[PDB]
Amino acid sequence: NTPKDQEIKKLVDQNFKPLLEKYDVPGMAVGVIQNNKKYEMYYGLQSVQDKKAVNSSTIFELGSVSKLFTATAGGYAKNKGKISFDDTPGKYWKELKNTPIDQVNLLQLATYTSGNLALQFPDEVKTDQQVLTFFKDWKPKNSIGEYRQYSNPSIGLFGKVVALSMNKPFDQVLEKTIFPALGLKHSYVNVPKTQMQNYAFGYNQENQPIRVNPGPLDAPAYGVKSTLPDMLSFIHANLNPQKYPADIQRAINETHQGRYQVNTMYQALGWEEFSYPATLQTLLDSNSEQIVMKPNKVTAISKEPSVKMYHKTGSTTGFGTYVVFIPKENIGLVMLTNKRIPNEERIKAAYAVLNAIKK
């Protein structure tokens, strides 16, 4: 119950708690890490029917914040020499050798610039064989590397290749190598039986309990579930990579490097990157329909900002996630909800908290 405890509680109550009523959200976890200390705020219920409160054990679906762990895995393999970002996917998924998609390099897959991969796989692509056929039948549309189109199949293929280069399934890459390296104890691609009691239900617009369904390359694109304490540890690792062993430290740093620019947004690996201080409008623009849903011409980076901040939104059918951190301020914030709320609301509430907090 320190002054800082009470300040952050007030700030989160002022800016995040009203969203519970506005959007009829059953449960929420909001955490701030500042000065290497975690402040955790919990609201409502992880399970309505069970009257089980959200707490530090509650497991939430991260949605596209999962892409940050896929990016980290990629940075890990790259800096161990298992892959080069200049490689093409057929070097590792041999069935793609000598197909058109084998002209796209791993960095372009990871940062969504293949020129012909949409937000989602086609509805009809479900089985492993259908995914393989999808990529074997793939052909270019836009000039490769020139257009960013935010895409699950794109970074999902990147993650599959990362896993192949490590001779392990993607779920094991994260659960056996990446999560332990980051110090995470309750982060999962597949929640085990002994943790199902901690796995929140998500809630749709009818307030029915739902969880993410299986989908093609789901694990690298949107398949991670985690707790508020683990996500604050992940933010700590991004704030303080020098404190971690070389292999994961290099991976974390690798994910921070901007690869190209779209207006005021720099695309890093998984993370979106901005010059800091960033305006609220800049952060909102990054999640506009134009940026999220449409192709945008990229521009090569002339000068990466010397002072930066990073964020990422994530959603599943039943869950919302937002993460943000600012190295120069040694501060970050995580929001987890078990009902989707508009991305702009997540960005606005986090902006108000991080800019009002005493430094």
Ligand X SMILES: *[B@@-]1(O)O[C@H](CNS(=O)(=O)c2ccc(Cl)cc2)c2ccccc21
Task: Determine if 120 is a binding residue for Na ion (CB under 5 A).
Answer: yes
- By C-alpha distance, which of 339, 337, 358, 357 is closest to 16? 337
Nearer to ligand X, 215 or 327 (CB): 215
Write down the least CB distance from residue 82 to ligand X, Å.
26
Cβ atoms within 10 Å of 78's Cβ, excluding its own: 22
Cβ atoms within 10 Å of 102's Cβ, excluding its own: 18
Task: Determine if 72 is a binding residue for Na ion (CB under 5 A).
Answer: no
Task: Determine if 313 is a binding residue for Cl ion (CB under 5 A).
Answer: yes
Query: What is the token pair recorded at 110?
Result: 């990871």
Total site size for Na ion, rule CB under 5 A: 3
Task: Determine if 111 is a binding residue for Cl ion (CB under 5 A).
Answer: no
Cβ atoms within 10 Å of 58's Cβ, excluding its own: 25
Task: Determine if 121 is a binding residue for Na ion (CB under 5 A).
Answer: yes
- By C-alpha distance, which of 189, 242, 208 is closest to 69? 189
Placement of tokens 């540890």 in the chain: 233
Task: Determine if 165 is a binding residue for Na ion (CB under 5 A).
Answer: no
Cα separation of 37 and 309, whole Å? 19
Write down the least CB distance from residue 20 to Cl ion, Å.
19
Residues known to be catalytic:
64, 150
Is residue 263 within 8 A of residue 271, CB to CB? The reply is no
Nearer to ligand X, 64 or 113 (CB): 64
Q: Please, after which residues is the chain broken with C–N above 2.5 Å?
A: none
The residues, ordered by sequence, that sit 6+ positions from 18 with a Cβ below 8 Å of its Cβ are none
Nearer to ligand X, 74 or 223 (CB): 223
Write down the least CB distance from residue 287 to Cl ion, Å.
7
Radius of gyration (Cα) for the chain, nearest Å?
Answer: 19
- Indicate the SS3 state at residue 222: helix
Write down the least CB distance from residue 39 to ligand X, Å.
25
Task: Determine if 116 is a binding residue for Cl ion (CB under 5 A).
Answer: no
Residue 121 binds which of ligand X, Na ion, Cl ion, none (CB < 5-8 A, kind-dependent): Na ion
Cα separation of 295 and 114, whole Å? 11
Nearer to Cl ion, 66 or 114 (CB): 66
Write down the least CB distance from residue 218 to ligand X, Å.
8
Task: Determine if 47 is a binding residue for Cl ion (CB under 5 A).
Answer: no
The residues, ordered by sequence, that sit 6+ positions from 122 with a Cβ below 8 Å of its Cβ are 134
Cα separation of 148 and 61, whole Å? 25
Q: Which stretch binds Na ion (CB under 5 A): 118-126, 161-169, 181-189, 323-331?
A: 118-126
Nearer to ligand X, 115 or 318 (CB): 318
Q: Per-residue x/- mask for Cl ion, residues 245 to 284, rule CB under 5 A?
A: ----------------------------------------
Residue 287 binds which of ligand X, Cl ion, Na ion, none (CB < 5-8 A, kind-dependent): ligand X
Contacts to Cl ion by CB under 5 A: 313, 315
